[PDB]
Amino acid sequence: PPVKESSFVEKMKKTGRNIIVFYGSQTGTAEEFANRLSKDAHRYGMRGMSADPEEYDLADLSSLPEIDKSLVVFCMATYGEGDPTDNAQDFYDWLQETDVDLTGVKFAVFGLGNKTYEHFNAMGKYVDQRLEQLGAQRIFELGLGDDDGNLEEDFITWREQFWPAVCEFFGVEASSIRQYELVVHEDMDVAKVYTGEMGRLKSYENQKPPFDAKNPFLAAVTANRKLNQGTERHLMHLELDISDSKIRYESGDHVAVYPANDSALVNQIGEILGADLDVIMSLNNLDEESNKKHPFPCPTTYRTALTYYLDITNPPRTNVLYELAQYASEPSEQEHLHKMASSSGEGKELYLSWVVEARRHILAILQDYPSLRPPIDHLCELLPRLQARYYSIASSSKVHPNSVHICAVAVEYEAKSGRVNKGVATSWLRAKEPARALVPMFVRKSQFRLPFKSTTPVIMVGPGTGIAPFMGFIQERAWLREQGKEVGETLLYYGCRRSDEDYLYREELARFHKDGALTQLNVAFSREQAHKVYVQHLLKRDREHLWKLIHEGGAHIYVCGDARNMAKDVQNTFYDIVAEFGPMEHTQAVDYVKKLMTKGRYSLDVWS
Numbered sequence: 001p002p003v004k005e006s007s008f009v010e011k012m013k014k015t016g017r018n019i020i021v022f023y024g025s026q027t028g029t030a031e032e033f034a035n036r037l038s039k040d041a042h043r044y045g046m047r048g049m050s051a052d053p054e055e056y057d058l059a060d061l062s063s064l065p066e067i068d069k070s071l072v073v074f075c076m077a078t079y080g081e082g083d084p085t086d087n088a089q090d091f092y093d094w095l096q097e098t099d100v101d102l103t104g105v106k107f108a109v110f111g112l113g114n115k116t117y118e119h120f121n122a123m124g125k126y127v128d129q130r131l132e133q134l135g136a137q138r139i140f141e142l143g144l145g146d147d148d149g150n151l152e153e154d155f156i157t158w159r160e161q162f163w164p165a166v167c168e169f170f171g172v173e174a175s176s177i178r179q180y181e182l183v184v185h186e187d188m189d190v191a192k193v194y195t196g197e198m199g200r201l202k203s204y205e206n207q208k209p210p211f212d213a214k215n216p217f218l219a220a221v222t223a224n225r226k227l228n229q230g231t232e233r234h235l236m237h238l239e240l241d242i243s244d245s246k247i248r249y250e251s252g253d254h255v256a257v258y259p260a261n262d263s264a265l266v267n268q269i270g271e272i273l274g275a276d277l278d279v280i281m282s283l284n285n286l287d288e289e290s291n292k293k294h295p296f297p298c299p300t301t302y303r304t305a306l307t308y309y310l311d312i313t314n315p316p317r318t319n320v321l322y323e324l325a326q327y328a329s330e331p332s333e334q335e336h337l338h339k340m341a342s343s344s345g346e347g348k349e350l351y352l353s354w355v356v357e358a359r360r361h362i363l364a365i366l367q368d369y370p371s372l373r374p375p376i377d378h379l380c381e382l383l384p385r386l387q388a389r390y391y392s393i394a395s396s397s398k399v400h401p402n403s404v405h406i407c408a409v410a411v412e413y414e415a416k417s418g419r420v421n422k423g424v425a426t427s428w429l430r431a432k433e434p435a436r437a438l439v440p441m442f443v444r445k446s447q448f449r450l451p452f453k454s455t456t457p458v459i460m461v462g463p464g465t466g467i468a469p470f471m472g473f474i475q476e477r478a479w480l481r482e483q484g485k486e487v488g489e490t491l492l493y494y495g496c497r498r499s500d501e502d503y504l505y506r507e508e509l510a511r512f513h514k515d516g517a518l519t520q521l522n523v524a525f526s527r528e529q530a531h532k533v534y535v536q537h538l539l540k541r542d543r544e545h546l547w548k549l550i551h552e553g554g555a556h557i558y559v560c561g562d563a564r565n566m567a568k569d570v571q572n573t574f575y576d577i578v579a580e581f582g583p584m585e586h587t588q589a590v591d592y593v594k595k596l597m598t599k600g601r602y603s604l605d606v607w608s
């Protein structure tokens with residue numbers, strides 16, 4: 001589909017670069033690591049560039065040996081269920097079918113994954129193994145970053161041993177540099193000043209299909225209601241009008257949205273830095289050759305950049321703090337910031353507890369290290385991009401073809417840093433009033449789907465907000481019964497804390513149950529009694545019937561929600577069911593369930 005760029009090898013020859021770092025990223029982490037590695041090259045006398053594999057034809061890897069002392073690095077994150085990130089899907093398909101000989105190619109791979117997921121770092125492992133099979137030579141061990149511990153630390157550790165290994169192999173030997181230049185614009189046509197749009201200038205005001213990540217559709221918020229009964233937390237239900245957008249979706253899909261940071265937080269960053277956020281400007285790449293002309297849409301004001309384009313709420317990465325150290329006039333403070341990039345020792349410890357664990361955002365660090373007064377433009381060049389957030393569409397297109405429903409809990413907690421942290425997208429979404437309140441969005445097709453046959457039994461497990469996609473599933477299955485179709489059993493295993501505090505969609509669910517769309521509404525109230533009652537407890541309670549639906553009914557199992565503990569607990573209970581009724585040994589029940597996943601009968605929509 002995408003028109004590829006001309007050979008990245010030729011571009012390297014023209015720009016005197018010998019190292020190219022590709023990033024397979026869904027949410028920007030692999031992208032940032034790749035930019036860092038690429039920039040590191042310069043410190044070791046080499047010259048590098050980072051690149052998006054989706055924009056090039058990786059077959060040109062076979063020409064890479066034409067450049068002396070050349071090397072290619074892949075920072076690859078895994079996504080979905082042991083799948084490539086969207087921007088790496090093309091590269092992935094090529095690796096599987098090509099037969100190209102990579103003799104002479106030198107490579108290294110750093111994988112980004114999460115040990116709590118079924119297939120840990122599947123993509124990274126695949127690319128690393130495949131390049132070798134194709135004939136290339138590994139110049140450094142595969143990196144296995146784990147987002148469940150601390151991914152940043154894994155990268156640091158890996159990066160520390162990578163460069164020395166690269167220098168050693170090519171016999172090469174080992175000062176703050178800016179990637180962009182500030183150009184302040186005096187009196188310009190507002191008609192050419194970005195105000196928050198993501199792609200084509202003025203694309204938010206002048207909407208034109210097709211709509212997607214690059215060209216989001218600004219959907220009107222037709223409804224935004226509180227879902228939970230109690231006041232402990234704030235759970236919400238929003239309905240986005242996608243009429244006339246020509247966007248198509250199915251239950252199980254995700255809808256992404258581009259939020260705006262908290263304006264007040266943006267005002268304080270400017271204030272504490274003594275900068276005018278209303279200045280119109282551009283940050284242009286000092287490398288007039290790169291396709292990346294700006295770190296974000298330019299020209300624009302800092303206010304706009306800090307509001308729609310930059311992430312100012314997550315814990316700054318170590319390289320960011322490292323580059324800011326130069327701006328801290330107080331020695332001890334400059335020392336602390338500088339040591340955040342350590343692979344061990346008290347500097348690493350301080351980074352892990354004072355920045356990560358305490359969840360200190362950029363503003364917090366500015367306040368707690370008062371001698372740190374970085375210029376606003378450099379900071380903007382260092383902050384990562386503000387990512388879209390995904391939400392499991394909570395409606396069926398068979399019933400609501402022109403509306404996309406969202407079920408989310410607002411994020412707001414007391415951090416160890418002493419302040420209250422707000423979730424960017426949920427705080428933004430929560431404040432949208434139906435009145436128009438517009439939400440930039442797009443739909444990403446998923447593989448979470450109802451069975452094709454209406455008669456196939458369905459087993460849905462989704463505690464808390466994990467119920468989201470199932471509301472769509474249920475509406476659709478109820479729709480099929482109404483349409484005169486023959487629908488098999490539909491069981492919902494939901495869980496909340498108290499039926500009078502956070503029982504989401506209580507009225508809607510009662511209805512579906514009553515009318516027969518829901519064969520069974522099994523709800524685990526985790527806090528109404530002294531002991532915990534979870535969804536897996538209900539599954540174990542119904543083990544005999546569930547086995548029957550699975551073994552003889554060809555039922556489809558779906559799990560949605562917390563991927564950290566809930567998914568595994570639920571999965572283990574399924575192991576116990578299969579093990580007991582097969583019967584078989586645990587190890588065989590585990591195989592059994594894993595095959596259900598390959599056969600498309602055990603799907604997951606788990607979050608982290």
Ligand SMILES: Cc1cc2nc3c(=O)[nH]c(=O)nc-3n(C[C@H](O)[C@H](O)[C@H](O)COP(=O)(O)OP(=O)(O)OC[C@H]3O[C@@H](n4cnc5c(N)ncnc54)[C@H](O)[C@@H]3O)c2cc1C
Nearest residue numbers: 389390391392407408409411413423424425426465468607
């Ligand atoms: C595929 C997919 C589907 C999803 N579906 C939904 C869904 O349907 N409904 C839903 O509600 N969510 C779902 N999400 C999560 C959603 O995408 C957002 O991550 C979530 O809404 C938070 O976004 P935010 O901008 O409000 O918070 P952010 O500003 O992005 O902050 C998120 C971070 O805050 C930190 N944090 C949260 N609570 C605490 C705490 N109490 N203590 C310390 N740190 C904490 C964590 O690091 C968390 O990653 C989904 C995520 C994925 C990936």
Ligand SMILES: NC(=O)c1ccc[n+]([C@@H]2O[C@H](COP(=O)([O-])OP(=O)(O)OC[C@H]3O[C@@H](n4cnc5c(N)ncnc54)[C@H](OP(=O)(O)O)[C@@H]3O)[C@@H](O)[C@H]2O)c1
Nearest residue numbers: 409463464465466495496497526534562565566569607608
């Ligand atoms: N954006 C998100 O929605 C998002 C993102 C990432 C992770 N998560 C995680 O998903 C989980 C649920 O969050 P939520 O806000 O949707 O609702 P929640 O109220 O935090 O949890 C929903 C229900 O799940 C129960 N539960 C807790 N641990 C369980 C487990 N080990 N196995 C089965 N059930 C368990 C909870 O009981 P108790 O609370 O009484 O133990 C509660 O009854 C949390 O761990 C949350 O951090 C959510």
Ligand SMILES: Cc1cc2nc3c(=O)[nH]c(=O)nc-3n(C[C@H](O)[C@H](O)[C@H](O)COP(=O)(O)O)c2cc1C
Nearest residue numbers: 025026027028029030077078080082113114120121
């Ligand atoms: C919906 C979703 C699915 C994921 N699936 C996997 C997976 O199968 N295996 C794995 O190792 N990590 C998985 N992860 C974790 C990511 O690989 C990890 O968080 C990575 O740092 C994200 O990088 P990015 O920001 O560069 O895309 C998943 C994360 C999300 C949000």
